Design an enzyme around this catalytic site. Sequence first.
Site, PDB file in Angstrom:
ATOM      1  N   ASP A 288     -32.487 -50.173 -24.193  1.00  0.00           N
ATOM      2  CA  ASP A 288     -33.432 -48.739 -23.211  1.00  0.00           C
ATOM      3  C   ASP A 288     -33.818 -47.800 -24.292  1.00  0.00           C
ATOM      4  O   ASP A 288     -33.598 -47.775 -24.942  1.00  0.00           O
ATOM      5  CB  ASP A 288     -32.522 -47.817 -22.377  1.00  0.00           C
ATOM      6  CG  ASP A 288     -33.404 -46.569 -21.683  1.00  0.00           C
ATOM      7  OD1 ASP A 288     -34.648 -46.828 -20.863  1.00  0.00           O
ATOM      8  OD2 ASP A 288     -33.530 -45.092 -22.647  1.00  0.00           O
TER       9      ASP A 288
ATOM     10  N   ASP B 220     -37.540 -47.662 -33.338  1.00  0.00           N
ATOM     11  CA  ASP B 220     -36.072 -47.837 -33.468  1.00  0.00           C
ATOM     12  C   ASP B 220     -35.301 -48.524 -33.703  1.00  0.00           C
ATOM     13  O   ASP B 220     -34.324 -48.810 -32.737  1.00  0.00           O
ATOM     14  CB  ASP B 220     -35.691 -46.846 -32.291  1.00  0.00           C
ATOM     15  CG  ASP B 220     -35.763 -45.648 -33.016  1.00  0.00           C
ATOM     16  OD1 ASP B 220     -34.545 -44.921 -33.431  1.00  0.00           O
ATOM     17  OD2 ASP B 220     -36.508 -44.548 -32.669  1.00  0.00           O
TER      18      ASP B 220
ATOM     19  N   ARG C  19     -27.957 -51.760 -32.920  1.00  0.00           N
ATOM     20  CA  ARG C  19     -27.513 -50.347 -32.587  1.00  0.00           C
ATOM     21  C   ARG C  19     -28.130 -50.203 -30.690  1.00  0.00           C
ATOM     22  O   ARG C  19     -27.628 -50.007 -29.761  1.00  0.00           O
ATOM     23  CB  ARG C  19     -26.988 -49.220 -33.042  1.00  0.00           C
ATOM     24  CG  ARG C  19     -27.726 -48.257 -33.770  1.00  0.00           C
ATOM     25  CD  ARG C  19     -28.170 -47.078 -33.831  1.00  0.00           C
ATOM     26  NE  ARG C  19     -30.391 -46.168 -34.095  1.00  0.00           N
ATOM     27  CZ  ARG C  19     -30.151 -46.169 -35.629  1.00  0.00           C
ATOM     28  NH1 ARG C  19     -29.090 -46.745 -36.184  1.00  0.00           N
ATOM     29  NH2 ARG C  19     -31.436 -46.387 -35.488  1.00  0.00           N
ATOM     30  N   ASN C  20     -28.933 -50.639 -30.722  1.00  0.00           N
ATOM     31  CA  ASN C  20     -30.310 -50.817 -29.505  1.00  0.00           C
ATOM     32  C   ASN C  20     -30.225 -51.582 -28.823  1.00  0.00           C
ATOM     33  O   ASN C  20     -31.614 -52.143 -28.860  1.00  0.00           O
ATOM     34  CB  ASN C  20     -31.661 -49.714 -30.367  1.00  0.00           C
ATOM     35  CG  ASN C  20     -31.064 -48.842 -30.728  1.00  0.00           C
ATOM     36  OD1 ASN C  20     -30.383 -47.604 -29.960  1.00  0.00           O
ATOM     37  ND2 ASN C  20     -32.080 -48.304 -31.150  1.00  0.00           N
TER      38      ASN C  20
HETATM   39  C1  LIG Z   1     -26.757 -49.376 -27.182  1.00  0.00           C
HETATM   40  N1  LIG Z   1     -27.396 -48.603 -26.522  1.00  0.00           N
HETATM   41  C2  LIG Z   1     -26.774 -47.095 -25.291  1.00  0.00           C
HETATM   42  N2  LIG Z   1     -26.715 -45.867 -25.886  1.00  0.00           N
HETATM   43  C3  LIG Z   1     -26.551 -45.380 -25.415  1.00  0.00           C
HETATM   44  C4  LIG Z   1     -25.755 -44.960 -24.101  1.00  0.00           C
HETATM   45  C5  LIG Z   1     -25.326 -46.316 -23.655  1.00  0.00           C
HETATM   46  C6  LIG Z   1     -26.286 -47.369 -23.872  1.00  0.00           C
HETATM   47  C7  LIG Z   1     -26.027 -48.699 -23.868  1.00  0.00           C
HETATM   48  N3  LIG Z   1     -27.254 -48.955 -22.608  1.00  0.00           N
HETATM   49  C8  LIG Z   1     -26.928 -50.431 -21.912  1.00  0.00           C
HETATM   50  N4  LIG Z   1     -26.173 -50.628 -21.824  1.00  0.00           N
HETATM   51  C9  LIG Z   1     -26.221 -52.252 -21.150  1.00  0.00           C
HETATM   52  N5  LIG Z   1     -24.728 -53.001 -21.199  1.00  0.00           N
HETATM   53  C10 LIG Z   1     -23.644 -52.336 -21.798  1.00  0.00           C
HETATM   54  C11 LIG Z   1     -23.603 -51.414 -22.908  1.00  0.00           C
HETATM   55  C12 LIG Z   1     -22.007 -50.732 -23.087  1.00  0.00           C
HETATM   56  C13 LIG Z   1     -21.097 -51.257 -22.621  1.00  0.00           C
HETATM   57  C14 LIG Z   1     -21.026 -53.039 -21.818  1.00  0.00           C
HETATM   58  C15 LIG Z   1     -22.180 -53.018 -20.962  1.00  0.00           C
HETATM   59  C16 LIG Z   1     -19.463 -53.030 -21.500  1.00  0.00           C
HETATM   60  C17 LIG Z   1     -19.052 -52.129 -22.030  1.00  0.00           C
HETATM   61  O1  LIG Z   1     -17.828 -51.861 -21.968  1.00  0.00           O
HETATM   62  N6  LIG Z   1     -19.999 -51.181 -23.246  1.00  0.00           N
HETATM   63  N7  LIG Z   1     -26.712 -52.542 -20.293  1.00  0.00           N
HETATM   64  C18 LIG Z   1     -27.577 -52.247 -20.733  1.00  0.00           C
HETATM   65  C19 LIG Z   1     -28.001 -50.482 -21.025  1.00  0.00           C
HETATM   66  C20 LIG Z   1     -29.689 -50.151 -20.782  1.00  0.00           C
HETATM   67  F1  LIG Z   1     -30.411 -49.774 -21.691  1.00  0.00           F
HETATM   68  F2  LIG Z   1     -30.340 -50.534 -19.968  1.00  0.00           F
HETATM   69  F3  LIG Z   1     -29.532 -48.578 -19.776  1.00  0.00           F
HETATM   70  S1  LIG Z   1     -28.734 -48.734 -25.847  1.00  0.00           S
HETATM   71  C21 LIG Z   1     -29.862 -47.332 -27.025  1.00  0.00           C
HETATM   72  O2  LIG Z   1     -29.208 -48.192 -24.310  1.00  0.00           O
HETATM   73  O3  LIG Z   1     -28.760 -50.074 -26.375  1.00  0.00           O
END
Ligand SMILES: CN(c1ncccc1CNc1nc(Nc2ccc3c(c2)CC(=O)N3)ncc1C(F)(F)F)S(C)(=O)=O
Length: 259
Positions: free
Chosen positions: A147, A129, A133-134
């Site tokens: 994650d 994956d 986006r990830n």
């Molecule tokens: C894009 N991803 C997601 N897919 C679905 C839901 C949520 C996320 C975002 N996940 C995370 N996001 C962040 N940081 C983060 C993000 C998005 C914003 C911010 C910070 C501030 C903001 O405004 N948006 N830090 C850690 C995580 C994690 F993975 F450890 F849980 S992915 C698959 O985890 O890369």
Amino acid sequence: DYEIQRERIELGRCIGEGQFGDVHQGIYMSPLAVAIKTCKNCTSDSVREKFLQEALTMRQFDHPHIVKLIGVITENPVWIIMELCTLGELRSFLQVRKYSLDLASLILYAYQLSTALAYLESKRFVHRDIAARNVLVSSNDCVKLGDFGLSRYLPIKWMAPESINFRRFTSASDVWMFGVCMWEILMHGVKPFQGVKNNDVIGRIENGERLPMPPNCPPTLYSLMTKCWAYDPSRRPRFTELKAQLSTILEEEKAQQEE
Ligand SMILES: CN(c1ncccc1CNc1nc(Nc2ccc3c(c2)CC(=O)N3)ncc1C(F)(F)F)S(C)(=O)=O
């Protein structure tokens, strides 16, 4: 012990939607900025077990460019506590900073991702994956794989031909994907094959066509992409080779940028 007392978490705003529920950013008071995966329907144990399994998966790994599991909260509502990448999603980061982010930085992100992917290969872990986006941004000199549970998609436009045709998933098909991920970064967070039907993607690839050189991409970097896109998986580089080659390209660009 990875079990966290809930009173030490203050939940902040929502930063996205997971397969199981909303993801929030927040703060962890330990005896730290964090992400909190929540789980809407974890009242049911089948759901709960799948959710919490996603924590164990992340627990296996320890790398500066993969998000770290901090801990879990295993009574309802069930949460997983992850490291926060402060600056959020890469694609948005790259789009908003399209005209203010230097090329050396884009190449850096590519390199850093390649160290994590070379690390995962050495753990014998096939990701499946790998897409912009990830990827997430901890600071403007650091990206990390997100994650793995949240990363779960078929993303035809990212996948290797053998993955599409025969559901073959190897580190070599991961390499194909990383090539598409590199193209995305150098394209400043544009998706591949926009305006193209998933079905024509396969035929085009078979016809020899590949994603075009992004504007202002070093030809050496683009060449390296196209090697990830060798139809025969045996003929793609290993992640460790991309790492070395990405380092040289990074250093060359830093020297061009006089730094
Ligand atoms: C894009 N991803 C997601 N897919 C679905 C839901 C949520 C996320 C975002 N996940 C995370 N996001 C962040 N940081 C983060 C993000 C998005 C914003 C911010 C910070 C501030 C903001 O405004 N948006 N830090 C850690 C995580 C994690 F993975 F450890 F849980 S992915 C698959 O985890 O890369």
